[model samples]
Target: NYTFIIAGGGISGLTLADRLTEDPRVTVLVIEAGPLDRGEDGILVPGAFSPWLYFWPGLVSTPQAGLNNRTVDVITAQVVGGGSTINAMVYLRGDKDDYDSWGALGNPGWSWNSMLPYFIKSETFTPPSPELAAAGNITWDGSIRGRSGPVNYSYPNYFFPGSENWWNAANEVGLPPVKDPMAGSKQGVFWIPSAIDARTMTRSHARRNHYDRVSSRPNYHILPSHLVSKILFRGKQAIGVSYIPTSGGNTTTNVYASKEITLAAGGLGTPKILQLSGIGPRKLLNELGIPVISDLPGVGQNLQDQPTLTIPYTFTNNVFPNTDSLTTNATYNAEQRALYDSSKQGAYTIVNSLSTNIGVMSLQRAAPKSYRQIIAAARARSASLSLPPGTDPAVIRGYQAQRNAILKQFENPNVGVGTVHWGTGSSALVYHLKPLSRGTVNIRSTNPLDAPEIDYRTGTDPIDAQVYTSLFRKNREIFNAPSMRVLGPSEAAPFGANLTTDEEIYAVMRELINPSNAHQCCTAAMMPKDMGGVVSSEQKVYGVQGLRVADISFWPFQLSGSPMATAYAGAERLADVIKKEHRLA
Candidate 1:
């Protein structure tokens, strides 16, 4: 009997499989609905080189508060590595407080301390040289990092042109530079990290790090390009799955796992699988005439996602134009390539070589008493920490305060913080990360082939609306900061430009912000059973023995940053858990 049957071959599933397969006796069977279409998915060696593409089967529309009443497209990959294959490939781990909040909310073993080791265990850090590290591109506690892990984390060796200038401008604007936010305290902007193998010039995702490592193992099996019809359950227990091979085989195959069946099919796939198996809200199941095995009202509730909007800039010179002629090698030099090949270390290992300066903002009501203590500690630490001789604390502290204030407003019904990121071209992208509004996903039909209806009610709350409006103002304010004046005049796009006044900004924000999408999460929430949690603290979906959901869908709340790192860590930890508890060793 297979020790573990994992559905999906994405980051989470691959991590889980790799962790469990360490036991020679344990066998893992992974089924993926899509094929390995690398270049087609907008995935390149360093994610920065990849152009964003439609990576999923269905084009989902979610309402947002930043874009005019338009429905934003929420695309997800249906391939082997799932969205991670198509994602921007930013390798961001949850901060200590982010995970601690989950543990505090009663999720045992999910605290930062408990999960930090796993983060370290799953990563293979590629530190920068003394000079580069000193340049504020790399910093982490080596004691807390795992150098022999499967995933190779690094930053891009090359910097985007004018990026340094932008950093300096940010400093002038009161946003300080940070070495590393993954060290638990994430307040300032820094070059973002990524999961990459700078040597091969191929995206180093779960498929490369976890699955490929074990693909040669005798007992591991991967069924690709196959569609799972339904999870076959014996009463309340999920025994196996029924799927169809896409090769015109009119036959369905049933694969059973004697030990456990894990669902790492991601945010949308997990709930859709459950709903198809009759484990969801009864009313929806009844509508499709499917017998309800479990009446889990929260099967697809709490659909959380950050709202993102792009501000494209056109340069007077061809300098900012697209690099249609540049090849991958032209973007990466030989010396840097050798560094990744020999030691698997360098900025090339990080989220595209592009630096992602993150500034966390807290809204008013969301700032609890505990938040004050955390902020105070951060302030104390910030004082002792020395930056380069010329670094300004005012810029750093001001940015910190802005993010903190944004976080505080999270509790306000009408207050939300706007998030902005610099992208290719001389433009910055702003978004709403911690939104007050919540929405859900539900089974549209009993048919497995049918798509689930996803309702992410973004910008519905007045507080959320206010947050977007305020963010639009803040984006202009920070860019226009005397320090950031080097960026030149801000050309408005969508809501920011059309709405010249506060009333206009609010109106444009209300209309435009209603459709932002990215970082979809929490469809199958993790919590105590009494709180309508579909899964337990251990990630086992309730009422189903030997069945668990280990994807972003299991998150209790939207993480402040990207979800890839957290998902990877969770999958790795779950793998260890399954092996230990099942005694597979």
Candidate 2:
């Protein structure tokens, strides 16, 4: 029997395991559904990641009624490191308001002020060199960052020259230039950092920073390629977990947890596990012929994600070589490969090398008039927005409270509505960060191996579409600015420069906006039980003992920044909470 049995050896699980086992008296076991990603260059090298690295039959969303009955691919890494292994490596801590809203949701100690320490404790930031800083227009304050943490945060060694143009264009468009986007409010154009080890030029993920470094610990054990079927319980208390080997096995085994069992299976995986264990909504479990252990209606509800629209452009003058072009350019590819293989510094060492600047803007900056209209309309309808049928009265109450909080943020200038990343070949990807449209993740079957039904319901709300449309127009303006005009940019997709009318832009967005930015979260939110909270401020389930969730699943809402840095910080904070409770610290 282990002191702590963590299901899913992803970011949070591995982090907790490392912390818990540090006491030597505690024994921690991590059960992962995917195999260990050992010696896979595509998964290890910072510059080698691509779509091919993604696991096949990836998590896919249900047909979103809001997106013309279309389903978008939900990309998540199935490897032991989880999404951190297969992500863009961009590291960003969302605006302070994002976390502060959590506290307002009745979850104390979750505010930005409370969580900032953990954010600092999780990173070993390596600021840009003098040369790279000057060339890339990078700026930061050393006082706000953690210098001795495990995960390495660094600016990429190489970026395309066109990045300067994008930065200049952002300034020309009246957007503020931020020295550090990670410092609470991210409301301007800046060179974002990545979870990459600058010295080795390797992807620095949870497995590397938290697991691999502590693999030698006697009390910490990991069971890879093991799929957890359900949490075994006795009289409302979790006692153990049952699992089957992923490698063609029918035999299932139960591993006992002596102290606690934490679920760090991510947003998508956690809710499904809860439902399978009969700990979710009573009505749904009854329909599935499963005995209800806990009747938590908020288990799989409140699913939130960012939806993005990719706009491509053609430049009269070639800006920079697309990384993908290396496959075709044999000579240049060979030269870059050789340079990287020898010195670990070249174009081949950078992932998405052409991406130089990322801009987070408020709706006020993107479209001031439309922003006011959207906020007023939302406030007008906030009282009337109905909850889902059979939703708990408490959840409705919590939803209402959350609605007020969100509306207040809509008026706050610090909160960003959209994020744009300037990419290579004159193309940019824009994300509607603060999307109001929420969805659900429900189980399709009692079978543990089955994937859940993920209905993102993207663009379901008109305000979300308005925000996207405004950002689209803003992007077009930035591209046409004098700084970018030197390249003679022209629209490349979905009726480029010719489409001028709002009707035309909205039509293209309806057809083109991808439903998932792979940032799916908030399925099992942390708030008051009456507020539809699945877990409490302590990350413990409301009705269950010795069981807690510690991933993005516990996030009350989606953050404006990428979830990776926040995920790491949250895990670090939770580890301390568990340690203190168990007297391990």
Candidate 3:
């Protein structure tokens, strides 16, 4: 028996293992559904490939109805390192208020002061060349940054000359330039830093940072290609887990945990595992004919996701030579060749084409209230109105109403929401990160081997639609502004581009916007049980003693930015809490 069994060898799981094993006495076992494949052409390399975006199997369960029931592909790595291996590598920790708000919302000891040490402890910044560093304007709060930590965190050195156009455009749009977003106050656009080594231009994945360091430890055993089935419990206490080895067909085995079991299978996998093991809503399990072992109604209820639309800008003419195109010279060039030869690593083996510059915007023009209150109201409404034993009618109806209201608000001249004409040009992306919506994840079939049935009521929520409509209206106005109009002219395009009215612009946004699921949170949420919380702030499942969840699944409300850094920090803090409570160290 091991001291701890951590499921899903992703970022959080690997971090927990590293933390627990550093004591030398605690034995940890990490079960991963996929092997750690870090080849030169692996999906981890940024801009290497597009399909690599959705890398995790079983993780892309379903989509939200608020998104028009469109199936969202979850972008998590199935390899040993999980999402860290395939993510865009933007290692960002949100504003201090983002964390302080958590404590104010009743989650104790989760403020910025308490969490800053852990963030610093887990990072190792690669020093930059004096000239490049100064030019890039890269600075760090040394008191809050870790220098010799395992995770190599730094700003990359490969900035294209033309990328500065974005910064200039931001200035023209009445936006301020921020030196660092991680320090909080992320109101303006800036050159964002990422979780990549500046020298080698490689991402600092969980395996690269932690797994590589602990691989030689005798007490640590990594079981790759083993898909976890469920938690085996004797009475109410979780004892072990039964998983299938995918090596030769399928074979099952049980691994017992002497202390406790941690579920770090990420947003999708963790909730699916809990439900499959008979730990979710009774109605859902009964419908699938799986025995209900627990009555956790909120297991997969509080689903939060983001909708992303990418605006493209085309040059009036081919501004660069054909050979200078990213397709030709970006990959397999002398710089990339030198890159691969320097570390003898897998980053240079693949060609990536995805956009590296991503911007996060708060929908102030749409939902003006604090995001937490919005989500809380949605959750309360969902709990009060009962369409069925398993379905939330209030949330569904509220969403529909909110969406209609947005369209009406945009059209009403007296309301003063905002307005724009169709065919607006000059590409700019708009995303509603904190959606006041909810969805579900449940077992699809009676067979334990089958993946669970996951559904996201994406665009079905009226509030989500209103939020999108407001964003579209604001974005169109920005495009028409003098600073951005220099780039191009607005023309009649598909989705009411030629229409001169605000109604036409709303119609166009509804038709053309690309909804995304890149941001998903609050699956196995932590809250007071009376408020439909499945887990406590301590990360322990309600009514269960030895089982815990450590992933994005535990967030009660969605955050304003990428959920990766917060999720990692949450897991690290949880590991410490579990270890201290058990007195293992």
Q: Pick the candidate with the highest lDDT.
A: 2
- Candidate 1 residue 295 C-alpha distance from true site, Å: 1.0
List, residue by residue over 1-585, the lDDT tens digit for candidate 2.
999999988888888888888888999999988877775777767666663464525578888777888877777667788888778788999899999998888887878898888888998999777998887788887888889888888877777667778789888986768978888987779887888888888889888889999899989999988878899998989999999886647789999998999999888889988999998888889999988888898899888888888887777875656554565568867877787889876676566434757898987888876788978877777532534556677667767776777778788888888987777664688898887777889998997877888888787766678778889988888888999899788888775888998888889888888877678788888988877889999999878899999889998777878899998889899999998888885
Ranking, lDDT, top scorer first: 2, 1, 3
User: Order the candidates by TM-score, highest first — what do you get?
Assistant: 2, 3, 1
Candidate No. with top TM-score = 2
Candidate 1 Cα RMSD after full superposition onto the native fold (Å): 9.6
Q: Candidate 1, 284: how far from true, in Å?
A: 1.0
Tens digit of per-residue lDDT, candidate 1, span 138-246: 5666787778888877655544444555566556544566556677655545767767654553567777788787777877778888776678888878888888764
Q: Candidate 3 on 1-585: residue-level lDDT in tens?
A: 998898889888988888899788899999998887644444545435343543655545454343434565555557687777766565677666556655554467878799887777777766555775566455555666677667776654544433344444444554445555566545555444567765556677788777887788988779988888889998889989988874435677899998899998877778888888888888778887777778777787766666565444443532222213445555445555566567633323222332223334444433344434434444445423322344544233433343333333223222222112111122445666545446666667655566565555555555466556656655555555555455453433553346656466555555554444355567787765655667877889888779998878887655556666776677778888988898877
Which scores higher on lDDT, 2 or 3?
Answer: 2
Stretches of candidate 1 off by over 4 Å are 38-42, 47-54, 62-69, 135-137, 200-202, 246-250, 313-358, 364-418, 493-500, 511-517
Off by over 4 Å in 3: 44-54, 57-69, 72-74, 137-140, 317-324, 328-359, 365-428, 473-486, 489-503, 506-508, 511-517
**Model 2 bad stretches (over 4 Å):** 51-58, 321-328, 383-390
